[PDB]
Amino acid sequence: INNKEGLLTALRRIQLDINPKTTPFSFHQSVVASKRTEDSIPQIEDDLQRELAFMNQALEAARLGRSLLRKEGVPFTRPTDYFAEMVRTDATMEKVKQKLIEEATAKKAAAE
Amino acid sequence: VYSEKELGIPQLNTVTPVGVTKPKGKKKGKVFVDDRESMNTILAMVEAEKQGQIESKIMRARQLEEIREARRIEAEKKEAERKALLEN
Amino acid sequence: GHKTTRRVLKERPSRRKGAQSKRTQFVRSLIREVAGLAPYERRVIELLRNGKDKRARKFSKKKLGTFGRAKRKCEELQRIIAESRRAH
Amino acid sequence: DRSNIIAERKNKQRVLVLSSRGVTYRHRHLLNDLASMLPHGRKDAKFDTKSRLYELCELAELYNCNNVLFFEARKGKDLYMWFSKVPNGPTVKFYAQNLHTMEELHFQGNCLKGSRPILSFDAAFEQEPYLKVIKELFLHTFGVPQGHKKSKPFIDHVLSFSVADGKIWVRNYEIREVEKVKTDINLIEIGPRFVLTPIIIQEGSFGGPILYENKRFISPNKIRAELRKAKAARHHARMEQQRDLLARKRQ
Amino acid sequence: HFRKHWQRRVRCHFDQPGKKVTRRLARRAKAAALAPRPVDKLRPIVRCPTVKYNRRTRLGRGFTLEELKAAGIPRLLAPTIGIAVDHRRKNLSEESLAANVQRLKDYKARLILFPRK
Amino acid sequence: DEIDPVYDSDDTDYNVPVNTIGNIPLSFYDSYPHIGYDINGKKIMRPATG
Amino acid sequence: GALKYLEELSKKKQSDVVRFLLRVRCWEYRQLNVIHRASRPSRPDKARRLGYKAKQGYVIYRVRVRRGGRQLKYQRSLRATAEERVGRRCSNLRVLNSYWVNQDSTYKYYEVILVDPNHKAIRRDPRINWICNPVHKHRECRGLTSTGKKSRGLNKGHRFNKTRAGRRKTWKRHNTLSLWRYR
RNA sequence: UUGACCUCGGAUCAGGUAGGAGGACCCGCUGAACUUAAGCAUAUCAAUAAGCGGAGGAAAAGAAACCAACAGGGAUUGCC
RNA sequence: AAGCUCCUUCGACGAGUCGAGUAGUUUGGGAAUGCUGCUCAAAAUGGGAGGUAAAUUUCUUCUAAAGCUAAAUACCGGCCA
RNA sequence: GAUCCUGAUGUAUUCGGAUGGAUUUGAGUAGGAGCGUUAAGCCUUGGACCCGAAAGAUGGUGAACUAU
Per the record, where are the segments of Basic residues compositional bias (chain C) (predicted)? Predict the structure, then answer.
């Protein structure tokens, strides 16, 4: 059960126009990679390689997005003066930096 | 007790932005503070942090306002420098 | 699974526990008329008469706690409005 | 204007993030993370399991939302995500597993609440026709429109969808800028990490003809039933062995 | 695994033979009360629920109304003549219904009923 | 008939602030001449002094 | 039919008639004592379905109970406290069952149906001679009323494993080490 | 003027009843700490001991808003 | 007085209770394991709990908020042996 | 059994592993050894070979202050 014609009919019903000649990247902000990540992930169980491939795909997306967005002239960098609510709380990142502290201290304490 | 500068602890992104971080073991561009407006804002920060708690609300407001005015004057000074070096 | 000859069971009154008592319905309607409406039901009636039907439904949710209960309360109050209109 | 959009071209998309009754704490944390990342969204509590999948559509009409992200938990163990465009089509069902939500103290990354993300998609997402329908809906869900008044003005994170196995892997990364050596982009994971496997794509809001079936979906209930049948099989093998032993002892 | 006070909660079954004699005498006393009658009520044969145990039968709680009617034993008289009745169990299968009616017919054939007073 | 995604009057987010600042305290920007940033990327000046 | 009419009228509580009546009564009960006797049940249908009869031997007591908590929460309800207080007042009667009547904002109100076990009519009539039996002394103190069963979790199912058949009895049964003669 | 009904009282009015003791086991309320382990903190001791209220020869529970996915079981309780 | 059978007649079932939000407490048990307090506050081809990806939320199984009841079970106290 | 491949008739057009392999792994197969119990020894938990530290908690009994 894979009805390609019906799937394409349904795409045509909802497909908002993303043609680059008429639609700006500031409007869609979606970029597709030019290389399948499953061709760079040989083994699915290999967590390190899997995460590395995911990160590389996201890095390519981020670089292309920055290039297009700077060409279009929208701010990209977050100023050091702009303080706003973050998705992860300040107490949460206090805990995160804390655990990083105990990890580093444990390592150098073993060395000492 | 050990310093987070000694430990290789990455910077974390909080409400205070990390900004464009500088690479470890590399030349970080030294920014020289020489404009009297810039010493004005730094000295205002130092004096505020030294004086600390003032009971009077208007006094707190005035010290904060002089800090903001020092920052502002530094801002137009830098903008004027930018314009001078960009057209002339 | 195993092959057993299916049997049809007699109707269970405990399964007939669902109330179809016309007399209970009559009692409920008469008691509604006699007692009147709660303040939140009066608010929902005002909203439904004015046409804010999506607002009424949201307020019914906020006051009851479930989509289905809000839908049933809104239907009951709309039927009361219709009966009042045809009675007047 | 009530669109809460200040832009030349208005992309009016409103998301309804819904939870079912049997969700767990991890599922609720995932839902909260997605809602925090979605500024054009509305969070909504338990939905009746005895209710109707199109009563979902009337509920979305109630809240004036044109996209539905529904969380349906089975046995308090397994997640299912229904992405939908209400009212007229199309809609996909995913089996959601392998959840690692936020407030897990091993991510080290963050982003602004409501800022526009960069959506990273895959060549498989552009090649396979059904992955193309799932890409469009995920764009409509995580779009974060350009002129929306609740979105943050600066961009700092990328949401990446990848297809490695017959599943879709989602990651969220902070773009940290580092000055070059005589800027460069580095990525640090910030948010939820979950695996989706597609099951059905229906033409229609929460119904209509089936357009795609996985036909290779292994249900966790199927694993549980296999374990139970294995236990019963060993017990019955032991009983048959006892009967054969008694018979040979008689012989 | 002795973090609690097992010493103040420990039980020794030194009264196993004494309890056995007590139970045997209790079965003797109810046989003295119900002299000609058996000291137990008739129980139906049922199938075990779980797929692990579904190939073996056991004794259930009581006989169902429709199988009792099929065997021809009145409901108000079955507990009187010593047949347990279970109003919650339902047949759902001709196999169980027929097996239980066979059991009740065997009881009918083997039963001796005294004519009231 | 298709949904028009507007924010009606009863919607919690019918009126949204222009500050584009979340639930963080205003202890920040206390030593700065501005308060928050708008959605277009422009910082927002404090009005004046009393 | 009056009993169903009253049942529906009690179901609709914030209705105008019931709200008005509850306000006036709430005032009257505040003017009255903390624990006092009733004459006739203010909710005859509830009293009847809980087991009240118009016989010589059945009495009603209305009790006022202060509402709130101890951040500590009292495991027994305000309903059980009212029953226990009414029993301590009328130590010669058996607390059959209590029901809600008013709530205001400072005190909840409860009418408690009590039965005299020493009355000849009660003793001769079955269906209540069980409460004449001596094992039922201070059911409200031992938690044997409906509120007591609800608080004890005396329900059957997988959600009531630790509390049904007695919580402390279950804990003891699970924490006894059983040693037999042949081990 | 008289007489009912309702509500609230009085009596060393007629007849009854409660208290206290006991508490081995039983039903509830309330409720620790010593100890053990772990960077720390939750946890453990323990839903225990102490305190309070209430019964009996047993108490409690108890006749499914149960278990289940069966070819079905069928109140409660206790042992393996 | 009672039981069955038949039917061109009927068939009544527990509300500040479920439930939603929340604080405490408790459990192996955020489908909140149960309980309590607090604000809101229900339904009648209804409600509760499970099963299920199977295409819609189908199927399965019971009737809560009224009550009584011996036995198998516990026992360092009572009358004894 | 497991991992990396090599890729057969064919098949529902997307379903499978056969042959040949690998400096691989098994607490593997390679013609069963376990169960019950007696005696001795060791480990852990309970008071734990015996005696002995300051403390904390629950519930009670009493008094000691030109302080009035």
Answer: 1-20
